[PDB]
Design a protein around this ligand. Structure first.
Ligand SMILES: c1cc(-c2cc(NCC3CCCCC3)n[nH]2)ccn1
Ligand SMILES: c1cc(-c2cc(NCC3CCCCC3)n[nH]2)ccn1
Lengths: 544, 544
């Protein structure tokens, strides 16, 4: 019975095979067939290529040796040579991840398999090495082990590397599927009793793989974007003032992108966006907003007014030494980011909001008058009195998050007449069913985060209506003229798409995105669609 | 008696004044004198410029209004106009920090003064706003307060802004020196009883300033590069494996630069380099190396061999989502970075070492034979036996750090015959004098860091001689062909400059730096010189 799957890199997890460039170069340069491939393997076990693959020498040292081998071969075949570096730079550059092969490895691992990459590779010291470094980073994170010939000083098809593989997997050979594009490198695994698959075209190899494992790997749905394992992330902490520290998770390099969650959420609400945005070439900073998770939660209502929250986010940038960040918010975080754009445009590279529209303050109406008007905002009046909503939300955390985090068709709450009914969960189940958007483990993460500070700080975001209104009136003569994106969600019944209809009057150059069949919890409801919209916008309007 | 100093931005802390571009543009475009300056102030208290300075409108909204004002003025003066945006983009871009003025503010603050910037400024939403954002960030960090007209909705010369200034300073007017380049903006401070200085040329203003404060500000020495306040930094934590977490301090944006300290140090040993490198356009990651400070310190000797330390630094990069970093090391950190370059060139953008040379393993001699040969390395044999050096170094932490951290002429230790004498501090004072390189507060920081784990993990770096030798022999056929810098220190009597004499044989393209009258503690001994060498090298060989 199988419990381990091993994949080669070149011609299996990454295509086209860098091997398959010597053949194409021969064809393109009208050189004798197999001339370059024979120069590459010249000397066999003691040749320059084996020394490279075992880590004895680096790629830049190997280039001149491959060059002499090519001359020696052209002399014997009685032919004239017309740059090995250019050939290899182009071949490595063209090699991209084989997405259906990676998808199969991901599924096997999701089903309990131990997965590994076993590869004959080199120590790359070329000026262009970063490309390969990026490829290896993207791939390796999805596997339990990465065994590289140049690091272990052993090469396929030597028998020692297969014994080393079995030792690292902690598995007997019959428990292992081994996939390779080189039949000779497949032979020692077969001899040991491993299931072996010779990879030519991906589809056929995956058919052989699903047949031998009994798991559907081809024609399969989805899947969801890569998520975050909280214990595997870099966690950052900045003191913005004596009693206030902000926590964030950080991933990637490039322009800084600050993600700001809503109520009652976490940095973890961006779990599907963090790996995608970092892979797209951005430095992601996913915040625990003030009052949440590992960030400080002072009890005072006034600590949560927009003017202080924005001032603190500017201090956060100052302490990290960032002159700007792109700010992307959702829900309350979306309101924060529009106010960052209005009050601190010099610090905001670009602004995006999910669901939350930009609506200016009405100087002729109190915020309470504006709230009472729309029946959907009744729960907000319930949130005003300190202690009342805290008690209901804190009473059973698992129930709170399971009742809240639901898709549009899983509706368990009716936010109209919340005050009259006397609560959010008054006619809601004690033991709600788990939404299709979340796992039990994901709910328990929110439960654990909320055990530290509870709901006082988060609910305080709603208790500064008058204060926020007075501050926002100072901006009534301004327009938002920095790059901006508004993303509406068709089925968010609180932050309806129509509420954004007048935004062009204040943000003339506004760009838009729209997600169909998407409820309030945008990032987890439609993560693939969110990622597509944000990456497209960042690349065109934000930079690097 | 003075205790507060207030500086204007334009024409005081930053030069040339953006104001002084309308005059130069008039001259360059043969327009009537004062035409642009009158269009800029048109309407006075209710004109477009006052609305801009109070934060009513943004800079991009003000541009077309200044444009109409210029047309109205050209019509009246009966002249023909030949782009306001281009004029202002160029003026803001040319404006740089007035270094002697900033130096004076730094000295006043070092002497106990409360310092502030009070400025008439705008909300900058131009595509080029980052330049100004960068300038404000650099300046603001050196002051207690930054009061901007567009954020407070008040403008100089209105009396309210001066009362607001006094309220924020918590000072009576006679306790305040106010420096400005506009006499009209100086008038209300004088009327209130503040000492006022009209700034034309810097030198004269500083002469007036030192006369009124009684502090030497002109012709003064140094000073030292900006240092780090540990509580003001962003602190990051990454779990590299179950029982090992690495702590780092992070500052800046740009290419990642990983700083690796030596024995027995801290991330804080790079305090003078962190702000300088971040200001130069780099993302600095200053590590607490394994065994130190807030990083994990497992007791096992083998946890500190170079192969595992390097593997962990690669995992650190993987978890932060960094395909590469430039690695800069000192002492033991310098040995680590050369091995990162040899074993993981794809992950190393460039490598630099302070003091520590790259010397290959001798396959014909045991590391203990090589150590016993050089009398200066005798203390290393003393470090071998677990517990012995730990007890001596842990007995009195203040004494340990005060005895170690000394300039070349302050020599209190003699590392020859350490074993024979029976310790590092056997003929060293119990209460050493404080070196001129460090403050008492800086020593207490190291003392506090070492209270957590002690010296077991740090000394374990020396207890893997055989293990490190076997691993290093695997690299004997390689060369370091990625960008590399070797910085020698003239007066380091352990890591002597001559020990680096053969490095070109292994690193043919090696670049060098050399610091005269510099001992072992390079970063704190000669911080200005270290910064100059590293920034010059990073900008030419590392990138952004
Ligand atoms: C104004 C109101 C809001 C807002 C969002 C929100 N979300 C929390 C709510 C979502 C649906 C279930 C009940 C809790 N409540 N108020 C956000 C930004 N500006
Ligand atoms: C080999 C030895 C060393 C080395 C540095 C060092 N520094 C600690 C030492 C400095 C002078 C005072 C006594 C402690 N000891 N051994 C560093 C890198 N490779």
């Amino acid at each position: 019975t199988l419990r381990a799957a091993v994949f080669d890199l070149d011609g299996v997890l990454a295509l086209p095979a860098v091997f398959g460039v010597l053949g194409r170069t021969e064809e393109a340069l009208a050189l004798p067939r197999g001339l370059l491939n024979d120069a590459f393997q010249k000397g066999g076990p003691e040749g320059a290529t084996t020394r490279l693959m075992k880590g004895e020498i680096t790629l830049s040292q190997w280039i001149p040796l491959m060059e002499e081998n090519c001359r020696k071969c052209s002399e014997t075949a009685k032919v004239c040579l017309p740059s090995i570096k250019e050939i290899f730079d182009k071949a490595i550059s063209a090699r991209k991840i084989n997405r259906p092969m990676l998808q199969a490895a991901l599924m096997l691992r999701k089903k309990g398999f131990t997965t590994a990459i076993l590869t004959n590779t080199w120590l790359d010291d070329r000026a262009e090495r970063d490309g390969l470094a990026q490829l290896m980073c993207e791939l390796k994170m999805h596997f339990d082990f990465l065994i590289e010939s140049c690091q272990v000083g052993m090469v396929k098809p030597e028998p020692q590397i297969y014994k080393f593989l079995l030792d690292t997997l902690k598995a007997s050979p019959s428990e292992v599927v081994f996939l390779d594009d080189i039949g000779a490198n497949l032979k020692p695994a077969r001899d040991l009793g491993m299931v072996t698959i010779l990879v030519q075209d991906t589809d056929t190899a995956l058919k052989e793989l699903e047949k031998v494992t009994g798991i559907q790997l081809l024609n399969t749905p989805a899947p969801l974007p890569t998520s975050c394992n909280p214990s595997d992330m870099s966690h950052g902490y900045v003191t913005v003032k004596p009693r206030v520290r902000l926590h964030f998770v950080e991933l990637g390099s490039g322009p800084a992108v600050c993600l700001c969650h809503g109520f009652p959420e976490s940095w973890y609400s961006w779990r599907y966006q963090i790996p995608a945005l970092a892979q797209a070439g951005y430095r992601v900073l996913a915040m625990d907003m003030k009052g949440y998770g590992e960030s400080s939660a002072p009890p005072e209502i006034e600590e949560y007014c927009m003017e202080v929250l924005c001032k603190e986010m500017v201090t956060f940038l100052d302490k990290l030494g960032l002159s700007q960040a792109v700010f992307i918010g959702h829900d309350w975080g979306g309101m924060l980011v529009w106010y960052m754009a209005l009050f601190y445009p010099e610090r905001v590279r670009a602004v995006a909001s999910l669901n939350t529209p930009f609506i200016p303050a009405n100087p002729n109406m109190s915020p309470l008058e504006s709230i009472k008007a729309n029946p959907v905002f009744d729960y907000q009046l319930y949130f005003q009195e300190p202690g009342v909503a805290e008690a209901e939300l804190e009473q059973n955390l698992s129930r709170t998050f399971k009742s809240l985090f639901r898709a549009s068709d899983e509706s368990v709450l009716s936010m109209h007449k919340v005050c009259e009914a006397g609560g959010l969960f008054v006619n809601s189940p004690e033991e709600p069913s788990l939404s299709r958007m979340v796992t039990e483990e994901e709910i328990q993460f929110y439960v654990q985060q909320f055990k530290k500070s509870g709901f006082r700080g988060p609910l305080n975001w709603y208790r500064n209506m008058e204060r926020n209104w007075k501050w926002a009136c100072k901006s009534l003569g301004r327009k938002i003229l920095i790059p901006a994106l508004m993303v509406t969600a068709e089925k968010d019944f609180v932050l309806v798409p129509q509420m954004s209809q007048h935004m062009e009057d204040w943000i003339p150059h506004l760009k838009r995105g729209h997600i169909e069949d998407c409820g309030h919890w945008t990032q987890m409801d439609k993560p693939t669609e969110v990622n597509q919209i944000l990456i497209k916008w960042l690349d065109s309007d934000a930079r690097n």
